[PDB]
RNA sequence: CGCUUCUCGGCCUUUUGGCUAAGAUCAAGUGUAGUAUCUGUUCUUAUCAGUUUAAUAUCUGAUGUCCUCUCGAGGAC
């Protein structure tokens, strides 16, 4: 009867979102806690880390991941500079039918840190293939995107015209993104760029009949030293 | 960025102070514990100036500290109860000018924990046993005996655990070469935990309870417990055995109470108040620190009250039973 | 001990690498850890003996038969 | 130890009597069950050093031959403050191996 | 006894190696002997072992023979095309359903 | 069943050995009160937080210590049932 | 040899001859151990590789090991993981140099399907964090803790106990403020399998460092009939 | 507000498509429906944007984007109807050409401006192959004799090559 | 232009030197604890109520009133 008494007084997910100051934080299962109020308040504190997603999944963790084939682990490039890949291949192949200064320099002289996630980055099944999104930034580009466009990749990409910069200057930039500035369209042509119609031109500056730009500015019209640094 | 940290002038506030003949000779010196610095002063007798004989750093919070001295020994050691897990016994070598660590015994994890001892430290006057107590649930006792070469030796810990019991102050009781007794104010919150109404928070008064070592059987038994009228905050040992009666003075809010076990009845006084003060009348008054002076002839205590008035307390006794307590103003 | 044991395990492994090729077995894969996987059933198999015994199963056979009928229906001066 | 979870320790108040290990078991930490970097000494409960047991291998139960130490880890995480680590259950392993012995030869 | 895994390894090993080197074969699986491999193959595994129930005519022949040549099963079993084990137990079964 | 009651014995004993641990049915009240009581013992410990309060209010360290130890009895109101 | 003193001495001699000659020859032969009879051991060979790498500084061997991690055979991948574990336990303070190198390996183990790789990878992190105590390499320990954490729901005693060990190592190396932030949201979850796991972790913390935890608890709002906020902590001066 | 993406080059990732649509608008649903057998692109995809004007803007701005070099057809989700044009301006390109000329119908082929080989300027002509005779007819009906950018436009059905 | 035969170029198949006594020959450590994977085998019941669970589940139990036909059915309610 006591279990039923708590059930009878148990809150709906709508009520729990209502009284609670933050409602998103509130999951469908939080309504099943002993104290809905303390649990939502504890999930609504800064810097906390949410419980891993697979607690309820009937199947196992990485057992569910299973079936596809995976390429063997790829060595850190600075270990790869030693070539111990080649030495191991040669000895292994002879059987199948290295100097020391390079190794010490590889560990100390030229070893550098990797890219590491900050506190709150939980691992989950698919995070290695999760598509990085949200990047609403027009300025960021790729090399696969540039090449598969036929647009230059690397340091010349800025003078390599994105084929929709001419449509930015023609209909305005993408209308969902007024905040989009396009170099050579709403900011000046990048350094050493040239507006033009030849292969590699920046079009013509978006212009009104008095001589002001209709989009951005097509021509481009403290003491940050750290405190205690080594020498 | 990589940083290196030095000091420029060491801490200079004082949180405990004990006085002994720490260097072996009739001249008597002070040890003061700053926060995490421990340093020994000595006041020169004629001119009265005070000299900092030595100041060492201990990298650890010192929570309590006591002086103590074996029977007929002419030095005085230093028991120090830190926030570490260990009790340690130090001794000041006047020659080389440094504290030597005579002993260090471990009994728990480190840091100002709740149930791991170290806060309260008490010793029994004739030098036989030291007890170290937490704020809850744990008390230990060590016995200290001189060896063949009369160097110091420390026993294995005894044990007095008792669940759900805060401890406001612990102090050794003076008895002549009998079982040592320690007399620790207490309080027992266990039932107040389960009073959904809120009663047992009130009507739960604190109980003074004489523990007692038992040299014969080598353990520690709670001998006498007894409720106190109202909450008191610390105890003053009363030099017992030959000089003076035995027993303890309690210095509770607004009163001071001699109270000893046996048949001795309880004796009270209210604390004399400032003629026409300006204080908010509701605020009580308590005793903050205290200091016994004991001479071959007599003894008297000084005790100091919240506003800063000293009082010279003396005990008028009938040969074994104390009859009246007599306070008079001293200074401020 | 190890030389004959290593030869024994190697010979077994080469043995149904040859047999898998002779039965033109599609749903066969060796993973990067050297264990045997059925791509049709998403099942891991330790030994080559375990893998061949898995191919004769209500699990393998029913998956093979279901994969079968679905494929046939699924094609088009 | 970390290897047979069916084993128990004395877990009373430590004392002043040092702990010793058999020649058989010697060279290891008692808890982290490694074999390296001995830092600090073991101390054992008064009972667990009473009686004939003066000088016994804490683990193997046999003759004391050397001192028993604590690995750097266990002393860094302060697992060395739990009193007597004296194991007050003999464990199935010694029993069963002796029994199979008496059977065989 | 034999487990299906050892069984499959046997099938493959035989079809590769031919019926004549049982030493190599038995070397393959652990806790299996060359004599046992040979026996099992000829007894159960080999495809020529016909695995069905007895016809009425087959049981007529069996009964008649085991009456003709008492207890000689390795002599009979070729004549009706089953193993000594099949002939033996199955004759036991007929005898028990009769009595 | 067996899991629940052996882990229940282990949690009740580990708790009666260490005041303040928890177990899968610890309620908001006991959590919060053990957490106060530890804060209190630690203010009286660290010689300094005492100075901080004894200057923030205008009381003297003996009176401050006394009020802390008064409160350690029932710091977060009376229990909940 | 079914005795242990024998195997012990064996390993120590392998160290000695490594010193006699040079790491590479002995390391190559030691690595050629796939030695099926797994425990009773190739494990002792793992210890031997550790002593090798230790006695002649691990500049030399760590590339060889990280290389072997590619050979697709199971027991040898796990061999390299163990050998790493012992390596860090043995050399201790010097890991402050190789932790940056090693991590992306351990990442790779902690994110894969089977329990043996996760249990052995978790041992490594334990020892590594205990060795790097106090040297400022915390960002990478924090990242390794993020991969370790999700196994916390698991069943096989060897992996659950390896994981718990790893977590208390990381406690001393990251601080308890971190472990507490990881441990909060599930102290009061509606489940009970999780609440079991989380209160087990949170005890294992609170027993150690129950003093440090004072300045770390979150601020919890008081309701009508109680008072849950500590005000003495924001007496402002 | 869903977009038909046809002619998408087999190697183009739906990730890359949503990547280009990231600068383009509220990328809400990128889905490259594919043959579940061969795995590679099915030459069709649906990309629904949250805003209709942003969807149409991506259709009108992403026109003929050379996917792996090949212009992919992004819009809402050769019958001999080609117009040729005389008097074409030399500063006009196929971009603005198709951008304006799309009015009478969808363009089936890339508008070829008649340009000479040496310097590369237009010879004064253009053409584009629409979808239907009605589309070429409405184009040549609104665009014949009228003023193109700086040269009066001339539109008539293209002479078959 | 039709037929037929031959020459060549482009090439989509197998391809160890034999005899001898099948030349001869033919290895598995043990124990204690725990996990994983295969092979195997099985749930269509309708409510309600209960137990239990985070939620199912499970498991527990029983199949509006009267007459009659053969759980169904008709009617007066
Ligand atoms: Zn250890
Ligand atoms: Zn003991
Ligand atoms: Zn032993």
Coordinates of C-alpha atoms in Angstrom, one line a residue, chain G:
Chain G
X1 CA 58.1 -24.0 -13.9
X2 CA 55.2 -24.7 -11.5
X3 CA 57.2 -22.9 -8.8
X4 CA 57.2 -19.1 -8.4
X5 CA 60.7 -18.5 -7.1
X6 CA 62.0 -20.0 -10.3
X7 CA 60.0 -17.7 -12.5
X8 CA 60.9 -14.7 -10.3
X9 CA 64.6 -15.3 -10.6
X10 CA 64.2 -15.9 -14.3
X11 CA 62.7 -12.5 -14.9
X12 CA 65.4 -10.8 -12.8
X13 CA 68.1 -12.4 -14.9
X14 CA 66.4 -11.2 -18.0
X15 CA 66.8 -7.7 -16.7
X16 CA 70.4 -8.4 -15.9
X17 CA 71.3 -9.6 -19.4
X18 CA 69.4 -6.7 -20.9
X19 CA 71.8 -4.5 -18.9
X20 CA 74.7 -6.6 -20.1
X21 CA 74.1 -6.2 -23.8
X22 CA 71.4 -3.9 -24.9
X23 CA 67.2 -3.9 -24.7
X24 CA 66.6 -4.5 -28.4
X25 CA 67.8 -8.1 -28.8
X26 CA 66.1 -9.4 -25.7
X27 CA 63.0 -7.3 -26.3
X28 CA 62.5 -8.7 -29.8
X29 CA 62.7 -12.2 -28.5
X30 CA 60.4 -11.4 -25.5
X31 CA 57.8 -9.9 -27.9
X32 CA 57.9 -13.0 -30.0
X33 CA 55.8 -14.6 -27.2
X34 CA 52.3 -15.5 -28.2
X35 CA 53.1 -18.6 -26.0
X36 CA 49.5 -19.8 -26.0
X37 CA 49.6 -21.3 -22.5
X38 CA 48.5 -17.9 -21.4
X39 CA 49.0 -17.6 -17.6
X40 CA 51.6 -20.0 -16.3
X41 CA 52.7 -17.6 -18.2
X42 CA 53.3 -15.3 -21.0
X43 CA 52.4 -13.0 -18.1
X44 CA 55.8 -13.5 -16.6
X45 CA 57.2 -12.5 -20.0
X46 CA 55.1 -9.3 -19.6
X47 CA 56.9 -8.7 -16.3
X48 CA 60.2 -9.3 -18.0
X49 CA 59.4 -6.7 -20.7
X50 CA 58.6 -4.3 -18.0
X51 CA 61.9 -4.8 -16.2
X52 CA 63.7 -4.5 -19.6
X53 CA 62.1 -1.2 -20.4
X54 CA 62.8 0.0 -16.9
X55 CA 66.4 -0.9 -16.5
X56 CA 67.4 0.6 -19.8
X57 CA 65.3 3.7 -20.0
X58 CA 61.9 3.3 -21.8
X59 CA 62.8 5.7 -24.6
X60 CA 63.9 2.6 -26.4
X61 CA 61.1 0.1 -25.9
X62 CA 58.0 2.2 -25.8
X63 CA 57.9 2.5 -29.6
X64 CA 58.4 -1.3 -30.0
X65 CA 55.5 -1.9 -27.6
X66 CA 53.1 0.6 -29.2
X67 CA 54.0 -1.0 -32.4
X68 CA 53.2 -4.5 -31.3
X69 CA 49.8 -3.3 -30.3
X70 CA 48.9 -3.7 -34.0
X71 CA 49.4 -7.4 -34.4
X72 CA 45.7 -8.5 -34.6
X73 CA 46.1 -11.4 -32.2
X74 CA 44.3 -11.1 -28.9
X75 CA 46.6 -12.4 -26.3
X76 CA 49.4 -10.3 -27.6
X77 CA 47.4 -7.1 -27.6
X78 CA 46.6 -7.9 -24.0
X79 CA 50.2 -8.6 -23.4
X80 CA 51.2 -5.2 -24.4
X81 CA 48.5 -3.7 -22.2
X82 CA 49.7 -5.6 -19.1
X83 CA 53.3 -4.8 -19.8
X84 CA 52.4 -1.2 -19.9
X85 CA 50.7 -1.5 -16.5
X86 CA 53.8 -3.0 -14.9
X87 CA 55.9 -0.5 -16.7
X88 CA 54.3 2.4 -15.0
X89 CA 54.1 0.8 -11.6
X90 CA 57.8 0.1 -11.8
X91 CA 59.2 3.3 -13.1
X92 CA 57.0 5.6 -11.1
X93 CA 57.8 9.3 -11.3
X94 CA 59.2 9.2 -14.8
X95 CA 55.8 8.7 -16.4
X96 CA 55.4 12.4 -16.5
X97 CA 57.3 12.1 -19.8
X98 CA 55.5 9.2 -21.5
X99 CA 51.9 9.7 -20.5
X100 CA 51.3 12.1 -23.5
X101 CA 52.7 9.4 -25.7
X102 CA 50.7 6.5 -24.3
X103 CA 47.2 8.0 -23.9
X104 CA 45.9 7.6 -27.5
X105 CA 46.6 3.9 -27.1
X106 CA 44.6 3.5 -23.9
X107 CA 41.9 5.5 -25.5
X108 CA 41.8 2.9 -28.1
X109 CA 41.5 0.1 -25.6
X110 CA 38.9 1.7 -23.4
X111 CA 36.6 2.2 -26.5
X112 CA 36.3 -1.4 -27.7
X113 CA 33.9 -4.3 -27.4
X114 CA 35.5 -6.8 -24.9
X115 CA 35.9 -6.9 -21.2
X116 CA 39.5 -8.2 -21.2
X117 CA 40.7 -5.1 -23.0
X118 CA 38.7 -2.8 -20.8
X119 CA 39.8 -4.6 -17.5
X120 CA 43.4 -4.5 -18.5
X121 CA 43.3 -0.9 -19.8
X122 CA 41.8 0.1 -16.4
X123 CA 44.6 -1.4 -14.5
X124 CA 47.0 0.8 -16.5
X125 CA 45.3 4.0 -15.6
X126 CA 45.3 3.2 -12.0
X127 CA 49.1 2.8 -11.8
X128 CA 49.8 5.6 -14.2
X129 CA 47.8 8.1 -12.1
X130 CA 49.4 7.0 -8.9
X131 CA 52.8 7.6 -10.4
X132 CA 52.0 11.0 -11.9
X133 CA 50.7 12.3 -8.5
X134 CA 51.6 15.9 -8.1
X135 CA 53.3 16.8 -11.3
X136 CA 50.6 18.7 -13.2
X137 CA 49.7 16.1 -15.8
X138 CA 46.0 16.2 -15.0
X139 CA 44.4 17.1 -18.3
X140 CA 45.2 13.7 -19.8
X141 CA 44.3 11.8 -16.7
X142 CA 41.0 13.7 -16.8
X143 CA 40.4 12.5 -20.4
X144 CA 41.3 9.0 -19.6
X145 CA 38.8 9.2 -16.7
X146 CA 36.1 10.2 -19.2
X147 CA 36.6 7.0 -21.2
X148 CA 36.9 4.8 -18.0
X149 CA 33.7 6.1 -16.4
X150 CA 31.1 4.4 -18.5
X151 CA 32.2 0.9 -17.7
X152 CA 31.0 1.7 -14.2
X153 CA 27.9 -0.4 -14.9
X154 CA 29.4 -3.8 -15.3
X155 CA 29.1 -7.3 -13.9
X156 CA 32.1 -9.5 -14.2
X157 CA 34.0 -9.1 -10.9
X158 CA 37.4 -8.8 -12.4
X159 CA 36.5 -5.9 -14.6
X160 CA 34.3 -4.2 -12.0
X161 CA 37.1 -4.4 -9.5
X162 CA 39.7 -3.2 -11.9
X163 CA 37.5 -0.3 -12.7
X164 CA 37.0 0.6 -9.0
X165 CA 40.7 0.5 -8.4
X166 CA 41.2 2.8 -11.3
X167 CA 38.7 5.2 -10.0
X168 CA 40.4 5.6 -6.6
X169 CA 43.7 6.1 -8.2
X170 CA 42.3 8.8 -10.3
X171 CA 40.8 10.2 -7.1
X172 CA 44.2 10.9 -5.7
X173 CA 45.5 12.2 -9.0
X174 CA 42.6 14.4 -10.0
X175 CA 41.3 15.5 -6.7
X176 CA 37.9 14.7 -5.2
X177 CA 36.2 17.7 -6.6
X178 CA 36.3 16.0 -9.9
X179 CA 35.2 12.6 -8.8
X180 CA 32.4 14.3 -7.0
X181 CA 31.2 16.1 -10.0
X182 CA 31.2 12.9 -11.9
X183 CA 29.3 11.1 -9.1
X184 CA 26.6 13.6 -8.4
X185 CA 23.7 13.1 -10.7
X186 CA 23.2 9.5 -9.8
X187 CA 23.3 9.6 -6.1
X188 CA 19.5 9.9 -6.3
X189 CA 18.6 8.3 -9.6
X190 CA 15.3 6.5 -9.9
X191 CA 17.0 3.2 -10.7
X192 CA 18.5 1.0 -8.1
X193 CA 21.2 -0.7 -10.0
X194 CA 22.7 2.7 -10.6
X195 CA 22.0 4.0 -7.1
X196 CA 23.9 1.0 -5.9
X197 CA 26.9 1.6 -8.1
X198 CA 27.0 5.3 -7.4
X199 CA 26.7 5.0 -3.7
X200 CA 29.5 2.5 -3.7
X201 CA 31.8 4.9 -5.6
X202 CA 30.8 7.8 -3.4
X203 CA 31.6 5.9 -0.3
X204 CA 35.0 4.9 -1.6
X205 CA 35.6 8.6 -2.0
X206 CA 34.1 9.8 1.2
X207 CA 36.3 7.4 3.2
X208 CA 39.4 8.9 1.8
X209 CA 39.5 12.7 1.6
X210 CA 36.4 13.2 3.6
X211 CA 38.0 16.4 4.7
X212 CA 38.7 17.8 1.3
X213 CA 35.1 17.1 0.4
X214 CA 34.0 20.0 2.6
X215 CA 34.7 22.8 0.2
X216 CA 33.1 20.8 -2.7
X217 CA 29.6 19.9 -1.9
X218 CA 27.0 21.7 -4.1
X219 CA 24.7 24.3 -2.7
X220 CA 21.4 22.8 -1.9
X221 CA 18.3 25.0 -1.4
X222 CA 16.4 24.7 1.8
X223 CA 12.8 23.8 2.0
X224 CA 10.0 25.0 4.3
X225 CA 10.6 22.9 7.4
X226 CA 14.4 22.6 7.4
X227 CA 17.4 24.7 6.7
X228 CA 19.9 23.1 4.3
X229 CA 22.2 26.0 3.4
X230 CA 25.4 26.6 5.4
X231 CA 25.7 30.4 5.8
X232 CA 28.9 30.4 7.7
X233 CA 30.7 29.7 4.5
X234 CA 29.6 33.0 2.9
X235 CA 30.1 35.2 5.8
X236 CA 31.7 37.9 3.6
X237 CA 34.6 39.8 5.0

